[PDB]
Symmetry: C2
Subunit: 344 residues, 2 copies
């Protein structure tokens, strides 16, 4: 049916997006102006040779949202075109809100996660409120207009996450995945409460994972294998969803927890402020090693590590900014191939 | 913390099984004889130098069971030894009863399965009762003393299985598995009602099977892949059990539905009465082809088909006669996957 009320629309674009739409359809502007009367908003009257006058109202509601009113005037079928265009200027995920509770966190365990998330560019976090019972932080996307509210009840150790599954949610849970248990990781990856990844036979999934990495399996770091097995359980137990692009977190994060492990193992430690950019270059669409440090290594390891970091950064970026199931599983198989190749 | 009442003990062995215990312990027999009165059974009084007289009574109940009474006489610490020996001569599975209902069956869909089941040695099936609503058959293991009650309500098409998960149950469900959908197969493999195989991502299990079967995946018998993926979902969704040796049925049946397909596909059709024995000999627990038919094929096929039939029959035989719990099953399944892959050129 699709509803047009209470939309999180970019306010400053509302007018321009319309003129660039009507000229896009070779219509004619009658009048574009602020709504008459004590209501705030925008009345757009426009039409085209052959039909009637389309009138569209746009109320700016009190909470920052934007309600479209296309059922008015003399031509509604023509206002619904503008309504559908503007409605489709919004990322679909914005129609979902998340409000979930993870268990077992303190200030000294959460503060580094917000710190690491804010080490990203389009991410800032500030302390919002605090009392004896609760400390609440706000994460803001400078690029978009998305905010994410993290409320830590210290008196019980409960971390409450509220907001929208946009860039902020994805960056924060990516930095969070290294700490979560099985049920917490499930809860953040599928955004549903009663997942069933716990009832997965860890032995059969372990046989799977051992099957994928042939000779590299007995040399696997346990901090990588536990997370990959958990993530595989998550992949297996997920119910129907529209977008599974988020279920790659187990592998991606693991790659980090392994790349950091081999990078520093060959004279390239990832310092906390330095990060990864201080070690790699981007030629085209395939990041390579800085030649100063690539010269000391065999070309095999060079190509392996280059493909690894390129994959990591490309997929992380395309998951942070929102570029169904077979595609995800193939990407996961590629990630597993990379992880196996890292081990000689 | 076990109880000794209502045991399905092999009656004619009850006494013999006992003496080879008492002589085994260099104990001494006081008296072994039938109990007084209208009860049938056996009273065993024995002891050894150093202790008191142990008395063990054994009543033969009316339903075929056997109640042991070791809390009698002057010595219980010694009577419980004999009682525990007799109690441990029984396969543990006899202590479970199954009573389940499968959906979607008619008379003509069950009869060929009972015929295929009765093609076995220690398995018989007979029509027990019949009315307008329900026809009930009894499967009997002549070897053991296990019976299985199969009750088909035609008015709704519901097949009820009652009894014990012993040899009869295992043979019947193996000949039945090729027909079942996913949830019926789960119901027979875990013997529980609220299994969770339906909520398994069939796509991830499909990726798993595609990983294991390299080139044989685009060459797969489709009726084999449906059953294999179903069984993989069941394997992944199964709750904790004592014996997982039974969750291997998906691969085994597949091999049959493939061997029969390639056997006949290479000039060796498996007739219904003839079976598979018409093509192989058994030297040393590793079935080989009769040279008569191995000579007509390239040396490649000989070892593959021989190892395939050898593995199938070994595992089926050890499952019909009850020889980590889950790692064991997964390793057996990995070998089965290697075999199924090698069967496809």
């Amino acid at each position: 049916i699709r509803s047009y009320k209470n939309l999180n629309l970019v306010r400053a674009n509302i007018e321009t997006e319309s003129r660039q739409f009507i000229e896009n359809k070779n219509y004619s502007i009658q009048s574009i102006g602020p709504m008459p009367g004590s209501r705030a908003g925008l009345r757009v009257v426009f039409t085209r040779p052959g039909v009637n006058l389309a009138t569209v109202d746009i109320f700016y509601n009190g909470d920052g949202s934007t309600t479209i009113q296309y059922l008015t005037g003399a031509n509604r079928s023509l206002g619904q075109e503008l309504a559908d265009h503007l409605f489709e200027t919004i990322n679909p995920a914005e129609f979902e809100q998340v409000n979930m509770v993870l268990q077992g966190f303190v200030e000294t365990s959460v503060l580094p996660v917000l710190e690491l998330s804010a080490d990203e560019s389009h991410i800032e976090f500030r302390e919002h409120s605090r009392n004896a019972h609760t400390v609440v932080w706000k994460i803001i996307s400078t690029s978009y207009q998305d905010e994410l509210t993290v409320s830590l009840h210290i008196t019980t150790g409960k971390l409450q996450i509220q907001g929208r599954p946009l860039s902020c949610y994805r960056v924060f849970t990516f930095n969070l995945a290294a700490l979560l248990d099985l049920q917490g990781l499930e809860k953040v990856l599928i955004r549903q409460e009663d997942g069933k990844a716990n009832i997965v036979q860890q032995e059969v999934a372990r046989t799977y994972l051992q099957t994928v990495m042939a000779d590299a399996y007995p040399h696997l770091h346990v901090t990588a294998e536990k997370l990959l097995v958990s993530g595989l359980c998550v992949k297996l137990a997920a119910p129907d969803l529209p977008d599974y692009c988020m279920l790659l977190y187990p592998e991606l994060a693991t790659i980090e927890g392994v790349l950091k492990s081999k990078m520093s193992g060959l004279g390239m430690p990832v310092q906390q402020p330095a990060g990864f950019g201080t070690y790699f270059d981007k030629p085209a669409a395939h990041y390579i090693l800085k030649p100063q440090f690539a010269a000391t290594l065999r070309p095999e390891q060079i190509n392996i590590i280059s493909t690894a970091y390129t994959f990591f950064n490309v997929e992380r970026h395309s998951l942070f900014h929102m570029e169904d199931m077979a595609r995800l599983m193939g990407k996961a198989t590629r990630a597993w191939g990379i992880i196996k190749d890292l081990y000689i």
